[PDB]
Amino acid sequence: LLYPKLNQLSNSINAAVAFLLEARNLEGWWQDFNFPQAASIGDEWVTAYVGTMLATLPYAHVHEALMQAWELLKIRDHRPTGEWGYNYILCGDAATTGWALQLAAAVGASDSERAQQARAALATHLQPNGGIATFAEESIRAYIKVPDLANVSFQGWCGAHTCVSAAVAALPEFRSRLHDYLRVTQTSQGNWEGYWWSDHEYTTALTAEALAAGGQAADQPSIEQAVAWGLKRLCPQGFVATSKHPNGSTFATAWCLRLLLLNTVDAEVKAARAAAIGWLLEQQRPNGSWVSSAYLRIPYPFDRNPNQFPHWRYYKRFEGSIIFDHNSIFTTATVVNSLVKAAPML
């Protein structure tokens, strides 16, 4: 163990936590992403995700910030299903609701009336193939009023989504029901592919974590296949390269680092994690943040497989475009979660 590197990991994590706590708005929300024409900036979703990312820190002031985040979410009680969504003006969705329920668990509110209502609402999104859809068709169709899209298929936006299913499978109440869908959607390469996210490391890490949490020995080979895929994705320099970031994506690398935590015995895996930690430490900005790289696709509503859509515009309407986390809060929270989880295994 190189104690200077252990200490820099502490200093890096602390700088990022300070960035994130200072980056809250006057009411205490984390905000990120922007649809400038009308939907504006994410809050409920971002807050649920960031709070969940910070939930493994031991700091009492961070637990207080998560308690506050949960109180903010409970005041967002305007939707009749009890779901949360991108922000106040959007309809509920399963992915935001799943992250909010993970935050609830971290602050001891899993058994609350609101958490029970929101879990029930998730059941409505279960599909005949055993996965979870992000949106109810009639709820999201209301936001698309342009003649050219108002009457197209919504079976892309309203079909089962692996990235959403993987996040909901973090909830013990759903893990068993989603198991078979998670198993059948694994590729021959050992990864999963998401719907909304560009970076397959997100879906792959969350899916492998849900299979690990279930503890079934039948799922361990699948988890090891995913870890092997992660090892291939991480280059020797310690990053995951993408077409957009051929010198490394901080968001993809962080999720890859999380995935590699699912094998604690293999020497090559431990060395790869150490390499990823080194690279992430080098990439941190002076203010504690990492550069935005959480790329969110807006497929056309009819698109059942955005992983087969060959021409995204980095953001005119937004269908066929990619947006990102302009505040770097989403990316930074992802990175600091991966570093906090990996540090004890350095």
Ligand X SMILES: CC1(C)CCC[C@@]2(C)[C@@H]3CC[C@@]4(C)c5c(C(=O)O)cc(O)c(O)c5C[C@@H]4[C@@]3(C)CC[C@H]12
Nearer residue to ligand X within complex by CB, 39 or 228: 39
CB of 152 to ligand X, least distance (A): 12
Site for ligand X in 252-311 (CB under 6 A): 296, 298
Q: Tell me the per-residue interface mask from 113 to 152 with ligand X, x by CB under 6 A, - otherwise.
A: ------------------------------x---------
Under rule CB under 6 A, residue 39 binds ligand X: yes
In DSSP terms, which residues pair with 160 in a beta bridge?
133
Under rule CB under 6 A, residue 196 binds ligand X: yes
Under rule CB under 6 A, residue 35 binds ligand X: yes
Question: Can you tell me which of 38, 60, 217, 265 binds ligand X, judged by CB under 6 A?
Answer: 38
The residues, any chain, with a CB within 8 Å of residue 6's CB and separated by 6 or more, are 343, 346
Nearer residue to ligand X within complex by CB, 119 or 141: 141
Identify residues after which the chain is interrupted (C–N over 2.5 A): 315
Find out whether 239 and 251 touch, Cβ atoms under 8 Å. no
Nearer residue to ligand X within complex by CB, 304 or 317: 317
Question: Can you tell me which of 70, 86, 255, 295 binds ligand X, judged by CB under 6 A?
Answer: 86
Question: Is the Cα dihedral 190, 198, 205, 208 positive or negative?
Answer: negative
* The two three-digit tokens of residue 178, written as one number: 């989603």
Nearer residue to ligand X within complex by CB, 12 or 328: 328
Q: How far apart are CA 198 and CA 202, in angstroms?
A: 9
Nearer residue to ligand X within complex by CB, 201 or 319: 319
Q: Tell me the per-residue interface mask from 43 to 72 with ligand X, x by CB under 6 A, - otherwise.
A: ------------------------------
* The two three-digit tokens of residue 44, written as one number: 């409920």
Nearer residue to ligand X within complex by CB, 86 or 202: 86
Distances (CA, A) of 6 to 217, 259, 274, 277, 327: 33, 20, 11, 10, 28
Under rule CB under 6 A, residue 17 binds ligand X: no
Question: Is the Cα dihedral 237, 240, 245, 248 positive or negative?
Answer: negative
